[PDB]
Amino acid sequence: HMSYTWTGALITPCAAEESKLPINALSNSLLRHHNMVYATTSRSAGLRQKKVTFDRLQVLDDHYRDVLKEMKAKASTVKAKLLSVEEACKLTPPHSAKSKFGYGAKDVRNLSSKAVNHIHSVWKDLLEDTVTPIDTTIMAKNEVFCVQRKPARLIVFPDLGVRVCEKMALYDVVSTLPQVVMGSSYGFQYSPGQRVEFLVNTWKSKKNPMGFSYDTRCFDSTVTENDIRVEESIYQCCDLAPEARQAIKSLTERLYIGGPLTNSKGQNCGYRRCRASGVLTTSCGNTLTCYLKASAACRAAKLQDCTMLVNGDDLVVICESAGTQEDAASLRVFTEAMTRYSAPPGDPPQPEYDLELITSCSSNVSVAHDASGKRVYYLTRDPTTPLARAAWETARHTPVNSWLGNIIMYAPTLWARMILMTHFFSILLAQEQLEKALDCQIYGACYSIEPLDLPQIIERLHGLSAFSLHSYSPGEINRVASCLRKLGVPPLRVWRHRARSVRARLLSQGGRAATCGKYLFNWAVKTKLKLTPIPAASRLDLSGWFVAGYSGGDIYH
């Protein structure tokens, strides 16, 4: 039961790829060790093929079947609706991959006759045909990292026509079902603030808390045909229209279970018998499968008071400790159970007794103080990848601006406030592009956001404290400092000086710009200003925000 079989044909790009960090007049002000920053290309995809290709062995016990029956019972209370062509089309990103059948992402959004006619043809084909495998494109991702070198991640996706039909049949399912089935354990329902609140409250509800994260070695490749069929049986519990049921069964047999892999040149690269990274159900299916395997493994390990938190392939468990030795022994049983269910780990899980030492979604909980010196818990991460990606975005215009998403999600952090906000507001002031909307990703979904709306947005998912945080933990400070030394980023003292300039330039401009200088850069000045609740914060249509994960699912909000 091999995840992949290969013909020998290479994974080809759609354009000339850059691996070296592009340099411009703004590069040195952010980063000096340019050699450290790189981007993955299709020319390293052969290295990934080896890693993702392996045999999957699966042993399913009563604990697995018990949890599944409980999951199907909760799923049977979900009612999901069938979306119209126009509704699914409006959810398609503008930078989305064009169809092989004469149309693109912009044609889809504009509802061109050629696109809509093909979408209807694929839909009719899904209702009539449930055996023929759907063709997918295997492409290599261009992701930017810092060295110590990752090979390119793989992206497997069906044609744009199929992707719109996937939305019609499963967009409501993947948006409603996860929270009903997993309850508070479903991580994508939370804003960064609601997440820390949930982790801190959960950690505090235990007599002697123990927490750990579980890292599955190549989760998509570990997903078996059984897992994909089990996902469909859960989707089929919902109150669905007979067209949606037929399209779900069809997309499962023909696409989700597996199919041929085709490169950008139209050559057969091989066959996939695992999870596709570029389908609508990637996030949802990964969450269901992980939660199911982990819940049953909690039961097998006899873990006391298991509180789970699942986001795709990412898993955090907070439970009652039984001492260091009994915890280490319980984590072995948990891993033995996960391995049996075809979910072995990358690095073995380790018991942690300090919430701040637990890393899940590349993030950890940390503590700072607000204006009244009161302790305040927030989400942070190592700023290496956010800084390296920002350095690339300083020289090249990318379809998705990682720095904007990073300011949104990590707004209370030291590194995002002092470096990310400073640098990019400076760039925006210079080009007078403060009023221009930029595309960014939040839980895998694409959002067109106006940078002048940043103070209202941050207040809504972090609170007003985000603008007043100080007296940061020594662990977080040394982490940021270490990252700056590594990449050659100017010290935090230089960033304060620069922020005083950016702030004054923003305030001079008045209006929304003055609000950005006021709220975002209050930390930069000794004589602080009055940070009052913003009237525009309530007037934010945050509908769709923190409902579900859509990573690789081709979603625009």
Residue from the set 258, 349, 351, 405 that interacts with ligand 1ER by CB under 6 A: 405
The stretch among 133-141, 294-302, 324-332, 402-410 that binds ligand 1ER (CB under 6 A) is 402-410
> What b/e string do you get for 163-183 counting C-beta neighbours within 10 Å, with b at 16 or more?
bbbbbbbbbbbbbbbbbbbbe
Nearest approach in angstroms of CB 373 to ligand 1ER is: 25
**Contacts to Zn ion from residues 55-74, by CB under 5 A:** 62, 66
SS3 state at 212: strand
Q: Which is nearer to ligand 1ER, 178 or 405 (CB)?
A: 405
- Which residue shows structure tokens 């045999």? 55
Residue 85 is a binding residue for ligand 1ER (CB under 6 A): no
Strands (E), 450-543: none
Q: What are phi and psi of 141, to 5 degrees?
A: -80, 145
Nearest approach in angstroms of CB 457 to ligand 1ER is: 13
Q: Which residues pair with residue 39 across a beta bridge?
A: 144
Residue 202 is a binding residue for ligand 1ER (CB under 6 A): no
Residue 454 is a binding residue for ligand 1ER (CB under 6 A): no
Give how far Cα 19 sits from Cα of 34, 40, 391, 398, Å: 12, 6, 13, 14
Rg of the Cα atoms in the chain:
24
Helix pair 384-395, 474-487: axis angle to 10 deg? 40
Q: Which is nearer to ligand 1ER, 211 or 259 (CB)?
A: 211
Q: Which is nearer to ligand 1ER, 119 or 445 (CB)?
A: 445
* Count of residues engaged in binding ligand 1ER, rule: CB under 6 A: 11
Contact partner at residue 44 from Zn ion, ligand 1ER, none, CB < 5 to 8 Å by partner kind: none
Q: Which is nearer to ligand 1ER, 504 or 540 (CB)?
A: 540
Contact partner at residue 66 from ligand 1ER, Zn ion, none, CB < 5 to 8 Å by partner kind: Zn ion
Contact partner at residue 252 from Zn ion, ligand 1ER, none, CB < 5 to 8 Å by partner kind: none
Q: Which is nearer to Zn ion, 291 or 472 (CB)?
A: 291
The stretch among 70-78, 86-94, 211-219, 440-448 that binds ligand 1ER (CB under 6 A) is 440-448
Residues 6+ apart with CB under 8 A from 398: 392
Q: Which is nearer to Zn ion, 68 or 97 (CB)?
A: 68
Contacts 24+ apart (CB under 8 A), 495-502: 495/418, 495/419, 495/422, 496/418, 496/524, 498/422, 498/423, 498/426, 499/418, 499/421, 499/422, 499/523, 499/524, 500/524, 500/525, 501/426, 502/421, 502/422, 502/425, 502/426, 502/429
Contacts 24+ apart (CB under 8 A), 121-126: 121/161, 122/159, 122/161, 122/162, 122/164, 122/165, 123/165, 123/168, 123/247, 126/165, 126/169, 126/246, 126/247, 126/250, 126/251, 126/254
List helix spans (H) across 110-159: 113-128
Residue from the set 361, 376, 446, 487 that interacts with ligand 1ER by CB under 6 A: 361
Least Cα distance to 453 among 537, 393, 557, 541 occurs for 537
Residue 358 is a binding residue for ligand 1ER (CB under 6 A): no
Residue from the set 199, 379, 390, 429 that interacts with ligand 1ER by CB under 6 A: 379
Residue from the set 279, 358, 442, 520 that interacts with ligand 1ER by CB under 6 A: 442
Residue from the set 443, 495, 550, 556 that interacts with ligand 1ER by CB under 6 A: 443
Rounded distance between C-alpha atoms, residue 223 and residue 290, angstroms: 9
Q: Which is nearer to Zn ion, 66 or 70 (CB)?
A: 66
Rounded distance between C-alpha atoms, residue 365 and residue 361, angstroms: 11
Binding-site residue set for Mg(2+):
215, 313-314
Binding-site residue set:
215, 313-314
Residue 178 is a binding residue for ligand 1ER (CB under 6 A): no
Contact partner at residue 363 from ligand 1ER, Zn ion, none, CB < 5 to 8 Å by partner kind: ligand 1ER
Residue 216 is a binding residue for ligand 1ER (CB under 6 A): no
Contact partner at residue 406 from ligand 1ER, Zn ion, none, CB < 5 to 8 Å by partner kind: ligand 1ER
Interaction site with Zn ion (CB under 5 A) = 62, 66
- Binding region for ligand 1ER (CB under 6 A): 192, 195, 361, 363, 379, 405-406, 409, 441-443
